Design a protein around this ligand. Structure first.
Ligand SMILES: *[C@@H]1O[C@H](CO)[C@@H](O[C@@H]2O[C@H](CO)[C@@H](O)[C@H](O)[C@H]2NC(C)=O)[C@H](O)[C@H]1NC(C)=O
Ligand SMILES: *[C@@H]1O[C@H](CO)[C@@H](O[C@@H]2O[C@H](CO)[C@@H](O)[C@H](O)[C@H]2NC(C)=O)[C@H](O)[C@H]1NC(C)=O
Ligand SMILES: *[C@@H]1O[C@H](CO)[C@@H](O)[C@H](O)[C@H]1NC(C)=O
Ligand SMILES: [Ca+2]
Ligand SMILES: [Ca+2]
Ligand SMILES: [Ca+2]
Ligand SMILES: [Ca+2]
Lengths: 407, 284, 146, 407
């Protein structure tokens, strides 16, 4: 009988005396003061960690966590890669308009459409436009900007568009949040009131992932290509009959792709290796770089390495991976000529005063993990007015009525 | 205890197979296959050649009521790396160090390498033979409408480049695509003719190599009970066996049905009790 | 099943000895002797040579709680011929026909004869050698005090 | 599944249809109308039998019997043979006076003593006198008659002596009954108020026979010769160190003994073979006839054959075994010269009017199984006065005060 504070719930089937047991840290410890392990770190008793909306506590070698329900996230990224709200990864290379999320599922209040076009010559497709339908308002995310289409007469569901780092962030008062890096990566977030009431290529958000491949006619199939071909918008769009292999159709681009994308499995990201699994991000980066064969492949690369480093910040590991030779960023472009306020914050974590939040206006999620260039406004005008990218005095910023900046 | 040479032993003592009890039963139909059935709802299949493998089957009544390295079986696969003390881990080797059955075992860590780059001589042998899972001229294209071999191909290259006996890892990974294809109806009759046929022709004189060997194709001693040990619910396996008739005798070759045996000790086909020894059944 | 050639078999299948389980265990120490112990309190010893014999041992916790051809084990021996339907029988073959395990067995009856009168050639061989249990020059007179 | 009404409680481990089952009599019978078996006879449903004081009933293939407690019987017979109140047979050949029954067991009310003398030359002993101590009254049974010794002043525990067949019967009002065949056989009976309150060579009468060998110093031994040597009355009497073997010390008397005593295992007694076990009565008869080697051995024989035939009557089988060549009896000795009233009743079963029972006086046991010569009084004086062996008119019989007949 030699217990170990890690084999408590194993069963002791097949040093410390009777009573005391090992802790994995050092000497023999009683059962009450036993520590806890989480992602290869060792936390003593009464320690506090957060898990995405909740707070936990190492009590007696076990974790005691609060039970609140967090927001759910769908991902669309690169050359046709998906993660559903329930966490199912798949690949679909379709060339039409597809339902991403909607609640017109068998009456409804929103719809989000993705427009996937061929990017390359191998037959893989990537997402190049997002259409957001909220009631009768139609936004559209296209050509690095948001466009308002068909604003209704007096309803006007309250939405907000602002720019956080390198991404554009649309939020709605009804609980719908769309985050877009202005090229191919989209993040949709829904408030936890939408549990089990959505469908599309992002699943149905009911914390059970063996029914995310439900087709439009309410049938759970096992194929990625019978599911994804049923959410196309036009009936005359073709069916995808196989998934392409880009590094087999381009044998000459494989050696560059597997050497550039090996940063993720290297010692640069070694703080995140125990917190986020790098293996589906390595395979996405190689799939993306073998297939950008018509032009601009160092943009297909730097997006795939920033999809992994974003998860690392979100889990508690800030990694600084960019150099002047590998994916450089140009943040002193935005400075007033040589007064240096715009700095590259590699993991976003800074909470400064805008001219929204000085008047109480706050968001419903935490977007303080988004990479980009952030201001550090001086002490004669310390209030950042967002719609012009200028630091202003707290009096002279603007108006913000009907989602339009008025000076 | 199921050692990797046969050698099933109960409470540190050798047992003879079959061994049927009240709560479980252990069978051995094909000398490289052991089938264990339990009354609780647990079924085991232990593979012994080329490499040792294990297959476990639970009913859906035990759904959300198991813990181990096999997860908790609740429909979601995001919480399979949830440890027995709270929270979900990130990597497989961090989850699985919480299920050590011995306290004095060291902790293991992941490995972000592929074996087909560390070995240049094994990576051409792995490419030529594991590509047969993907090309349609072979008897593996019949399963491409059901099984989608793109993830078996990635593991076939993994195990072939990694282990020291590369053919035993090839033939184990090709016999796992064929195993998981017979689970969806499509049975591959005769996939061992060019690739892993180093044991096909080595069957004895009367019995041949089969692809659908099951428990209830046994001797006429199994016909004496005929409702006690059949154990439906398993999968068919491939080994040496007898054809559509001529059931197995007590030892050696399999004689036809008329002079099989009369099983007590299995008597020959010349004994009269008043029950004359006959084809399978007895006139009692 | 304990056949009279060794050949212990569990559920119509041969077993190898020893065979230790959770509720019972079967041993074989001397190749003409089988020892079976149970967790309930029942112990068996099966003799195999020269002729097959059986010895059964119960604890005293199971006192007045068994039925069979071995009686009920309550201290009195006047009620061992008490059948499972009431009343005490007179003879041993009338009691024991009520404990047939098969319905198609015939009924047996007593036999008020001695075999040493029916056979004159066996009755001198029986007298010469069984008398060694009674004479004191042999190594059987040591037990005559007990 | 083929039940048989005899294998109900067996268990059916290893013709009639489902439902019905065999009865052992003939065709298939339901379970409710199933018969019963007792001593190789087959009794249908609702049948009545008696067992020694009780009454049974074949109800549903099982017996339903009343629960009253019967009298208990000790036996002393032949050349030192015993049966205790709990039914344990043993042999003891002692030469002294022995305690048979008493309740002065570790203060007391009675004592019965037996006087065992050598009868033969082989060392076996038989009982030749009985002393009955009841309070302060002392009877003594000696020389074919009863003798009153020391009748106390005013207590005088009420006893009764009468002659029933060939035996002499003493009864007491306290529940003590002694039956004596005037040679060597004694039967003691006690009322069921004496349960567990007696000791001696007859045991202690507590319905549990593995403690009948309790010695005088309250120690249960396993030897017949340590138990019996502890109930001798005088300390200077010797100890019996072995039991004799009479047919080995008299080889010339074995051939006669085993041929005469083979009546018991023969076709004469074949009605009783299923009701009383003849085997301990065959072995007693051969032991008794090999050892009456000083004179009168046809008296030692005829007593041993009448000990078995008495049990047969008591269990329900009247056997007539005497002939003019084998153990003759002389009952027309008692007749008035040639008026024939005294008949040999071989199994006693006749209930006529005495001059006791015409005045209400009745016994507490049933002695109507005792072999002997019985009257059959005529129809001008049909009342049998017992103390003179005369049939008298119902008026002129006697007085019966203080256990004495007064004409
Ligand atoms: C954050 O969520 C809350 C909760 O829904 C939003 O508050 C709603 O705002 C709309 C109009 O803006 C009202 O009609 C609702 O009644 C409000 N809900 C409640 C429960 O009072 C809030 O608008 C969201 N934040 C932002 C910045 O839009
Ligand atoms: C049969 O037994 C009864 C019951 O003991 C005897 O009745 C007793 O008689 C004596 C005197 O004769 C009384 O002192 C007792 O009180 C009686 N007992 C009861 C319970 O009343 C009866 O005497 C016995 N029969 C014979 C013939 O003696
Ligand atoms: C296995 O399949 C073959 C077909 O060639 C046939 O003998 C039969 O269907 C199976 N054999 C059995 C069940 O013994
Ligand atoms: Ca789902
Ligand atoms: Ca799970
Ligand atoms: Ca008993
Ligand atoms: Ca007793």
């Amino acid at each position: 009988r030699a217990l170990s504070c890690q084999t408590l719930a194993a069963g002791y089937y097949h040093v410390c005396p009777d009573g005391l047991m090992d802790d994995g840290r050092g000497g023999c410890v009683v059962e009450k003061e036993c520590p806890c392990v989480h992602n290869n770190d060792l936390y003593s008793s009464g320690a506090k960690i957060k898990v995405d909306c909740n707070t936990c506590t190492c009590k007696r070698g076990r974790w005691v966590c609060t039970q609140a329900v967090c927001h759910g996230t769908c991902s669309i990224y690169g050359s046709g890669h998906y993660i559903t709200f329930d966490g199912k990864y798949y690949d679909f290379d379709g060339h039409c308009s597809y339902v991403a999320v909607q609640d017109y599922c068998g009456l409804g209040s929103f719809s989000i459409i993705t427009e996937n076009v061929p990017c390359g010559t191998t037959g893989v497709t990537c997402s190049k436009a997002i259409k957001i339908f909220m009631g009768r308002t139609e936004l559209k995310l296209e050509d690095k900007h948001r466009v308002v289409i068909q604003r209704d007469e007096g309803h006007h569901v309250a939405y907000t568009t602002r720019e956080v780092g390198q991404y554009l962030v649309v939020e709605s008062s009804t609980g719908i949040i769309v985050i877009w890096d202005k090229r191919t990566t989209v993040f949709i977030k829904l408030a936890p009131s939408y549990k089990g009431t959505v469908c599309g290529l992002c699943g149905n958000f009911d914390h059970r992932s063996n029914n995310d491949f439900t087709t439009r006619d309410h049938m759970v199939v096992s194929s990625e290509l019978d599911f994804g071909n049923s959410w196309k918008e036009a009936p005359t769009c073709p069916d995808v009959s196989t998934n392409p292999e880009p590094c087999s159709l381009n044998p000459h681009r494989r050696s560059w792709a597997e050497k550039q994308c090996s940063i993720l499995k290297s010692s640069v990201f070694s703080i995140c290796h125990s917190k986020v699994d790098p293996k589906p991000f390595y395979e996405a980066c190689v799939h993306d770089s073998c297939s950008c064969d018509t032009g601009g492949d160092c943009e297909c690369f730097c997006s795939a390495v920033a999809s992994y480093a974003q998860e690392c910040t979100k889990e508690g590991a800030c990694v600084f991976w960019r150099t002047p030779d590998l994916c450089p960023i140009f943040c002193d472009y935005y400075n007033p000529p040589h007064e240096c306020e715009w700095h590259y914050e590699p993991c976003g974590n800074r909470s400064f005063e805008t001219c929204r939040t000085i008047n109480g206006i706050h968001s419903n999620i935490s977007v303080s993990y988004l990479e980009g260039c952030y201001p550090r406004c001086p002490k004669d005008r310390p209030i950042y007015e967002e719609d012009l990218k200028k630091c202003v005095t707290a009096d002279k910023c603007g108006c913000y009525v009907e989602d339009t900046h008025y000076p | 205890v199921f050692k990797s040479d046969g050698s099933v032993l109960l409470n540190q003592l050798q047992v003879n197979l079959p061994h049927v009890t009240a709560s479980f039963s252990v069978f051995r139909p094909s000398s490289y296959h052991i089938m264990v059935s339990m009354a609780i709802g647990v079924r085991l299949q232990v593979q012994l050649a080329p490499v040792m493998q294990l297959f476990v089957t639970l009913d859906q009544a035990s759904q959300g009521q198991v813990q181990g390295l096999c997860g908790n079986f609740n429909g979601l696969e995001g919480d399979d790396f949830k440890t027995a003390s709270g929270l979900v881990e990130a990597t497989g080797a961090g989850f699985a160090n919480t299920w050590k059955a011995q306290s004095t075992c060291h902790d293991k860590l992941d490995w972000l390498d592929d074996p087909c780059s560390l070995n240049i001589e094994s990576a051409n042998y792995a490419e030529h033979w594991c590509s047969l899972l993907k090309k349609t001229e072979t008897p593996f294209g019949r399963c491409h409408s059901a099984v989608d071999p793109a993830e078996y191909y990635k593991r076939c290259k993994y195990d072939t480049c990694n282990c020291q006996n590369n053919e035993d890892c090839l033939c184990a990974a090709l016999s796992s695509y064929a195993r998981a294809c017979t689970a969806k109806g499509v049975m591959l009759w005769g996939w061992r003719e060019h690739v892993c046929n180093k044991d096909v022709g080595s069957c004895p004189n009367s019995q041949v190599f089969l692809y659908n060997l099951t428990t209830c194709q046994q001797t006429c001693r199994s016909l004496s009970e005929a409702d006690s040990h059949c154990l439906e619910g398993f999968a068919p396996v491939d080994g040496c066996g007898c054809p559509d008739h001529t059931f197995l005798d007590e030892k050696g070759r399999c004689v036809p049905l008329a002079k099989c045996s009369c099983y007590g000790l299995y008597l020959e086909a010349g004994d009269v009790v008043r029950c004359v020894c006959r084809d399978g059944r007895l006139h009692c």
